[PDB]
């Protein structure tokens, strides 16, 4: 799924709000990005959120 | 039951109240017994393969076990029943006198 | 055959008795079908004898593997 393998950031639900305050359901996506990282010490390319990449601890291969 | 096949009991209730007789058969599931000479019924039997003539038979009918009491060996009066261990074997004792029945 | 007697035999001896009882049961079922069997009570007794013997055989197998 569109869930960050490292931080777990995934889609979350909430409301959209019009000016008249009408509420309708919507989701917030994680900013997931295809990157090569170590998965069990074996470099696989998986989806990681930009935020998890921001640090730099998540090293690309 | 407090009585068993073979015991001489007195009938304490019913038309045959006061009559003594031997238990010919016990029916523990129904709490009824068969007492010699008590509760005679007239069965209207049809001719069958076993009995070709049929006829109206006189026959003992079971009575409820709570309508009979065993007799005391000493006095010959009715007694309630108790139990004691004797030689590593439980036996019925006549509560009135104390003596063993069987 | 009560269980105590069954246990005194060896496994080889018991399985033979099973075969003998199977012969008895087989003949009894044939007699019943033809209406030539009087003592119907024998069938159930033989079945329980076979069960009894199989129970003792299996008991020994279990004590062996343990």
């Amino acid at each position: 799924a569109r869930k960050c393998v490292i931080t777990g950031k995934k889609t979350t639900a909430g409301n959209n709000r019009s000016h008249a305050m009408n509420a309708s359901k919507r989701t917030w996506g994680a900013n997931l990005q295809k990157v090569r990282i170590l998965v069990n010490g074996k470099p696989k390319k998986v989806y990681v959120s930009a935020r998890a990449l921001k640090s730099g601890k998540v090293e690309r291969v | 039951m407090h009585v068993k096949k073979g015991d001489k009991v007195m009938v304490i209730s019913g038309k045959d109240k006061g009559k003594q007789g031997t238990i010919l058969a016990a029916f523990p599931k129904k709490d009824r017994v068969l007492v010699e000479g008590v509760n005679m019924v007239k069965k209207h039997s049809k001719p069958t393969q076993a009995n070709p003539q049929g006829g109206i038979s006189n026959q003992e009918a079971p009575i409820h076990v709570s309508n009979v009491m065993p007799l005391d060996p000493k006095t010959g009066e009715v007694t309630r029943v108790g139990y004691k261990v004797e030689d590593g074997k439980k036996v019925r004792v006549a509560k009135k006198s104390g003596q063993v029945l069987d | 055959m009560k269980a105590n007697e069954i246990r005194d035999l060896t496994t080889a001896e018991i399985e033979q008795k099973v075969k003998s009882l199977k012969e008895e049961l087989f003949n009894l079922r044939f007699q019943l079908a033809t209406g030539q069997l009087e003592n119907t009570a024998r069938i159930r007794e033989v079945r329980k004898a076979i069960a009894r013997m199989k129970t003792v055989i299996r008991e020994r197998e279990i004590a062996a593997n343990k």
């Binding site: - | - | 199977k22 012969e23 087989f26 079922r29 079908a33 033809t34």
Partner: protein
């Protein structure tokens, strides 16, 4: 498995009696026995020589006793033909 688990009981009917003149014996057999098993069992048990075994399955019959209704057990009937030069079965 033992031969005597395969054969259940003989079938004793006008039809089976007729077949016993042609040296064919009708048996009820275990519902899982194939006709090869039937052939082997008859030889072992009765000490005869089997020419061929024909076999058929019978459905349960619908049956009623008062308000209660149910099915009879399904059966498997084997007709065992002996060879011309074989000993007959004794029953």
């Amino acid at each position: 498995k033992d031969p005597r688990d395969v054969l259940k009981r003989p079938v004793i009917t006008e039809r089976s009696a007729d077949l016993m003149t042609e040296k064919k014996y009708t048996f009820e057999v275990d519902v899982r026995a194939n006709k090869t098993e039937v052939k082997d069992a008859v030889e072992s048990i009765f000490g005869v020589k089997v020419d061929k075994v024909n076999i058929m399955n019978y459905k349960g019959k619908s049956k009623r006793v008062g308000r209660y209704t149910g099915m009879t057990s399904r059966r498997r009937k084997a007709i065992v033909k002996l060879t011309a030069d074989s000993k007959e079965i004794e029953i």
